[PDB]
Amino acid sequence: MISLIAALAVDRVIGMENAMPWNLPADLAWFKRNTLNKPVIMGRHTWESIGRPLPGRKNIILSSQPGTDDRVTWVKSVDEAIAACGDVPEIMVIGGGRVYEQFLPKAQKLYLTHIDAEVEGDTHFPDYEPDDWESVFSEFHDADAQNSHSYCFEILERR
Ligand SMILES: NC(=O)c1ccc[n+]([C@@H]2O[C@H](COP(=O)([O-])OP(=O)(O)OC[C@H]3O[C@@H](n4cnc5c(N)ncnc54)[C@H](OP(=O)(O)O)[C@@H]3O)[C@@H](O)[C@H]2O)c1
Ligand SMILES: Nc1nc(=O)c2nc(CNc3ccc(C(=O)N[C@@H](CCC(=O)O)C(=O)O)cc3)cnc2[nH]1
Ligand SMILES: [Mn+2]
Ligand SMILES: [Mn+2]
Ligand SMILES: [Mn+2]
């Protein structure tokens, strides 16, 4: 099973200048809980944005060019990325925009955080078709001393 996980600001913005400008510790904790002990697939730009391997997960990086770090696994196509995960119950695709576009048609589940923040961005989550997806979990949180925007954790499953 393939799943996508992402945090979206207003208008589906996910990034700006290869960075995520906000800081929501509660959402990073949610990301960790839902990805730990699973393979994560990311594109090269997102690898560079994170800047290090994510511990406790098999890190698989898509790039058309040879890898430059043997602490992670490098693959050259979507099918190779999936194969490199092996026989696991759930593969987590962690972006960015161009990678999410390619894996969305193959995904059964979306883990989306909707952040009530306006962000100038240059990267968006794909414009998926809402009729294809059932919301099976949603949990709203107001802003607090640690998290400066309100946010909604949602899980959607392909109908
Ligand atoms: N808010 C969130 O949830 C979230 C999550 C992830 C990322 N982001 C943000 O998203 C932005 C990065 O997204 P992006 O769209 O620019 O880049 P991306 O999807 O991370 O990376 C694209 C790169 O991945 C490689 N790639 C993708 N598909 C491939 C394929 N089928 N075969 C081979 N290589 C492939 C290519 O690398 P080569 O050029 O080396 O061939 C391509 O240039 C950053 O701002 C980051 O902060 C946000
Ligand atoms: N909901 C969601 N939020 C995100 O921030 C997110 N980020 C990415 C890509 N970028 C990043 C950037 C940093 C870390 C990171 O430092 N994660 C730690 C945090 C642990 C914690 O704070 O409790 C990790 O071990 O996962 C993960 C992904 C992809 N999907 C996402 N999905
Ligand atoms: Mn092929
Ligand atoms: Mn198999
Ligand atoms: Mn806000």
Swiss-Prot record:
Residues that hold NADP(+) according to the record: 7, 13-19, 45-46, 63-64, 76, 95-102
Family: Belongs to the dihydrofolate reductase family.
GO molecular function list: dihydrofolate reductase activity; dihydrofolic acid binding; folic acid binding; methotrexate binding; NADP binding; NADP+ binding; NADPH binding
Keyword NADP: yes
Gene symbol of the encoding locus: folA
Name assigned to this protein: Dihydrofolate reductase
Alphabetical list of InterPro entries matching this protein: DHFR (IPR012259), DHFR-like_dom_sf (IPR024072), DHFR_CS (IPR017925), DHFR_dom (IPR001796)
Organism: Escherichia coli (strain K12)
Stored Pfam families: DHFR_1
Start and end residues of each DHFR domain: 1-158
GO CC, any one term: cytosol
Biological process, per Gene Ontology: 10-formyltetrahydrofolate biosynthetic process; dihydrofolate metabolic process; folic acid biosynthetic process; folic acid metabolic process; one-carbon metabolic process; response to antibiotic; response to methotrexate; response to xenobiotic stimulus
Effect annotated for changing E154K: In strain: B[MB1428]
Role noted for this protein: Key enzyme in folate metabolism. Catalyzes an essential reaction for de novo glycine and purine synthesis, and for DNA precursor synthesis.
UniProt miscellaneous comment: The strain K12 sequence is shown.
Superkingdom to which the source organism belongs: Bacteria
Keywords assigned by UniProt, alphabetized: Antibiotic resistance, Methotrexate resistance, NADP, One-carbon metabolism, Oxidoreductase, Trimethoprim resistance
EC number: 1.5.1.3
Pathway: Cofactor biosynthesis; tetrahydrofolate biosynthesis; 5,6,7,8-tetrahydrofolate from 7,8-dihydrofolate: step 1/1
SUPFAM superfamilies referenced in this protein's UniProt entry, alphabetically: Dihydrofolate reductase-like
Effect of substituting M92F: No effect. Increases catalytic rate about 7-fold
Catalysed reactions, semicolon-separated: (6S)-5,6,7,8-tetrahydrofolate + NADP(+) = 7,8-dihydrofolate + NADPH + H(+)
